[PDB]
Amino acid sequence: SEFMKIAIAGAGAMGSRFGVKLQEAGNQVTLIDNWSAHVDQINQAGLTVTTVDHVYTMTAQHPEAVTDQFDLIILFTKTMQMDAMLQQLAPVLTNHPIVLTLANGIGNIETIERHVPKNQIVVGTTVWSSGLTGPGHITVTGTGSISLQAVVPDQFPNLADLITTLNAAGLNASAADNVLAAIWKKAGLNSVLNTYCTLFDCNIGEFGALKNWQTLTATVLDEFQAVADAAQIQFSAAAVTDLIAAQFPAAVNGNHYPSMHQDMANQRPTEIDFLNGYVAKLGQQLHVPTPANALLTQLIHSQEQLKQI
Amino acid sequence: SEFMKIAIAGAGAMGSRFGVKLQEAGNQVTLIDNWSAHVDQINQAGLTVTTVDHVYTMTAQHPEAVTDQFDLIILFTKTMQMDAMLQQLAPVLTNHPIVLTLANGIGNIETIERHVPKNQIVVGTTVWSSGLTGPGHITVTGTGSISLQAVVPDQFPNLADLITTLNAAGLNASAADNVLAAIWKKAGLNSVLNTYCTLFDCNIGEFGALKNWQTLTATVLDEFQAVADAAQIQFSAAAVTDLIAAQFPAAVNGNHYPSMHQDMANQRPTEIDFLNGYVAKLGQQLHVPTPANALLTQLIHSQEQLKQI
Fold first, then answer.
1. Fold designation for B179-308
2. For residues B262 and B257, what is the distance between their CA atoms, to the nearest angstrom?
3. CB contact under 8 A, B219 and A298
């Protein structure tokens, strides 16, 4: 009775690991992904998991080819690519499946709401890890857990059943009321380190060595706090600030250029509209001024244009 | 009776040209400057003016060596270096000379007020041109004019006499009530082009080619407008915007990197505290929010620190 037909929407490292565990536990799983080499490798040779190499027979498809329907969609697609993924799955969605989003981003609920009724939406965080070694190949270490929060708890049926299914697969899921808070916490970190490192062409340690890192950090985070306050989402600029500063040492991320800096260096459009830009979007709706975050968003967009030439 | 003993404080291209014309017209002139090679060249071989080379015997000194006193100090020192210049001339100032500042900057009055009574202060603009070819050598073309505005008109004696002296020297000076407005206009241009070009490592034409140049420009200038409004200084974001956009073509400044970008590239501290930073300083005093300009100021300071490593 814990059985589910499950789509993994975005079958990168995390989706692929969740999908293997779910299928091996007895569920019917489809991995859905845009990466042709990955989809083909899974379908032609199976998914390889390295812990020692284990090979699993799995089903993978491009979104536009999916005609099946499911009990559960687990979304790992990045906020910036989420809308297009959901558009391409429009026919899959008519049976009103549970949509569990485990992606980073404050914009995910609003995005998913354009495609499915909001009482079908569950948000999650996870500390499972996974690396994407190559097409159809993940490398996995350790254990983890999942924390889940229904977006409309009063109208979401059978969160228990959902949790059972995940726990039957050994995923260590639990209900919690602080998940969207945890999502916003990660967004606050990312909207400081990604954005400033990109603007400055510097790594995380160089940022932390700035004589004005605290002012730059507070300018972003006090706006995040005011927005979160108006949205009635728990948030602590101080806690995020602690987490930011914990990245600074070389032993941690001091010599790391964050993902947005990498996007910029490779002339790829950044996720700025889903980070600082999204705080600014929400602040406008909530009558909370977000001039810093609005400006930072513009600066990154200008930088993109200049880099593309 | 139009005779004056005049100090030129900051004897670069403009100061040197004004000083020559003033001396040749009959006044006693001291050129005051920090550049040792310039001071020595003037004192040892005279000032050369090229129009055809003409050589003039002039007096030049370092500020710390000046013991004379004057009827008029004409200040050409950049806002950022002004305070130190005025400090070094502290003994020169005890006879309460006229202080005419022809330097760019919204911060000049406040700066000079720390060193002299404010009713002694006159602000000016000029369209005289001059180039500084080398130590003790200027190259000069064309004619010009000077517009002057006493800071406290009701308490400044003999603006007429001042104008006579300058006109006797063929400088084409006039009284006007829109000079501080013209100074703020130039500051609005500079606080957009210098600052954004530096942040983006781009030239003026690249800035003008940005798809969001107008938004970036308005973000700075609407704050300048609000501050100017509170300060009761005439200002038009629209007019400044026109002047900004007039720089964009290659025929004009499209391939030019502005002075702040050059400072940054040479690891020299920029004048940001006297541009965007000064609008923010004044806005704070006037209860006008200036979050964009405050942030931009911080970004430039971070950039400086990173460049200095």
1. N-(1-d-carboxylethyl)-l-norvaline Dehydrogenase; domain 2 (1.10.1040)
2. 7
3. yes
